[PDB]
């Protein structure tokens, strides 16, 4: 097989800067003494992959010329000249010169932008979940940057770790932010024995945490 | 103007078999090469099959003798028949039209190879506490719990509330997924105007429309 080794794995880049992505083959591709069928695809969050470049350096229709493919021997490069927020996602190289067709492992392009604090909300368990014997308390932490953030759950002023489930969105292709949802799950029986439930969000933007809470009465 | 829609994904036991379809429009199938490419849970892309415009069939060795690509140019559908399914066949399967220096991929259909039971979601409303405060923007949500397999789709007011939505990726715990979705609207519009999360789970043929009611 033709093995494609793609680097880097993650590529953080600021708006208007240049990103370079490299793909290294295990052999010379040229089919016979004809064309080299090396292609570049982008997958944006929530979408399917789309063609950027074919035969090493041709732009697919409607791809702007700030996308530029080159390469020779075993090294192929995709250069993105003036990165916009919408360029984020996972880039793959691909060869179709020899069967089996193969892809590089991918490069995740991430946009750097200004720091932004999350907007935090808390939600008590619904009466219909209580009925079935479980109790989930939810914090949304919306639209922040950078991605890294910590949530600490407190029940009556003391930390709880067991039963926390956290999930981040991909990076938003508009404002370049992340959001995350944190869910503390307990039994109805344990939920009914405590009053105050708190999530505390700690994040680069403040030395003090953002604290949201409610009382079970 | 090209459309491709894949269908036929869902759950299937190791050893079982499944037939995928790709339903094509705005072009004649026969004039293009049609392929299947899958994306694994680790986000590798892998080529799985091609059929040229002239009808030659091409497969990698990892699926040879198990997978069959075919087309029906009367219904304008391309198929992938899979058998002796294994765990490593778990992936999102895309249908791809190729020709004339162009590629166009459908939205994908998810195939999960697993022994776990098909289970519909429980959908729980997330409404602010009684004593919470105004802000002028109010955030509401939906918690979608206990289902298998992926995917579920979540919309708000049937797609009418599309901005200010964050739908969080599902996470697997045990043999069960959990996901949530938030929506943010002006406080002048809620509760005066209804906000309902619409959850569909095609593998159990289930839809839940949960209205978010203010508490107490």
């Amino acid at each position: 097989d033709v093995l494609l080794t793609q680097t880097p794995l993650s590529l953080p880049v600021s708006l208007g800067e240049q990103a370079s992505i490299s793909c290294r083959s295990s052999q010379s591709i040229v089919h016979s003494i004809g064309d080299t069928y090396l292609e570049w695809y982008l997958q944006k969050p929530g979408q399917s992959p789309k063609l950027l470049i074919y035969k090493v350096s041709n732009r697919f229709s409607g791809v702007p010329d700030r996308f530029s493919g080159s390469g020779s021997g075993t090294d192929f490069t995709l250069k993105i000249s003036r990165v916009e927020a919408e360029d984020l996602g996972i880039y793959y190289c691909f060869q179709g010169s020899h069967f089996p067709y193969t892809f590089g492992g991918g490069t995740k392009l991430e946009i750097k932008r200004a720091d932004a604090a999350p907007t935090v909300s808390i939600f008590p368990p619904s009466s219909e979940q209580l009925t079935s014997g479980g109790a989930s308390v939810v914090c949304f932490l919306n639209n922040f940057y950078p991605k890294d953030i910590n949530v600490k759950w407190k029940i009556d002023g003391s930390e709880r770790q067991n039963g926390v489930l956290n999930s981040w969105t991909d990076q938003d292709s508009k404002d370049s932010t992340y959001s995350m949802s944190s869910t503390l799950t307990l039994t109805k029986d344990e939920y009914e024995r405590h009053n105050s439930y708190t999530c505390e969000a700690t994040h680069k933007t403040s030395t003090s945490p953002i604290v949201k809470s409610f009382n079970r009465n | 103007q090209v459309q491709l829609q894949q269908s036929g994904g869902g759950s299937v036991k190791p050893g079982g078999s499944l037939k995928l379809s790709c339903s094509a429009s705005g072009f004649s199938l026969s004039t293009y090469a049609m392929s299947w490419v899958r994306q694994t849970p680790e986000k590798r892309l892998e080529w799985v099959a091609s059929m040229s415009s002239g009808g030659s069939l091409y497969y990698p060795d990892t699926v040879k003798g198990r997978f069959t690509i075919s087309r029906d140019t009367v219904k304008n559908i391309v198929y992938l028949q899979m058998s002796s399914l294994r765990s490593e066949d778990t992936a999102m399967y895309y249908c791809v039209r190729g020709g004339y220096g162009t590629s166009y991929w459908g939205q994908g259909t998810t195939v999960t190879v697993s022994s776990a039971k098909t289970t519909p979601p429980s959908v729980y409303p997330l409404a602010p506490g009684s004593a919470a405060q105004t802000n002028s923007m109010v955030t509401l949500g939906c918690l979608v719990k206990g289902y298998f397999p992926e995917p579920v789709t979540v919309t708000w007011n049937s797609g009418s509330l599309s901005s200010g939505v964050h739908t969080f990726p599902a996470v697997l715990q045990s043999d069960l997924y959990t996901l949530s979705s938030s929506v943010t609207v002006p406080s002048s519009t809620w509760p005066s105007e209804t906000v309902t999360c619409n959850v569909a789970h095609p593998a159990s043929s289930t839809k839940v429309d949960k209205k978010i009611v203010p508490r107490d």
């Binding site: 089919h31 016979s32 004809g34 064309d35 069928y37 292609e39 063609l51 074919y54 691909f94 060869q95 179709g96 010169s97 067709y101 | 004039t31 293009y32 090469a33 392929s35 490419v37 080529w47 091609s50 059929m51 040229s52 415009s53 002239g54 030659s56 091409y58 791809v96 190729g98 020709g99 004339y100 220096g101 162009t102 590629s103």
Partner: peptide, 9 residues
């Protein structure tokens, strides 16, 4: 490449 061309060489 059948991903971009109708036949393969």
């Amino acid at each position: 490449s059948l991903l971009t061309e109708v036949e393969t060489p």
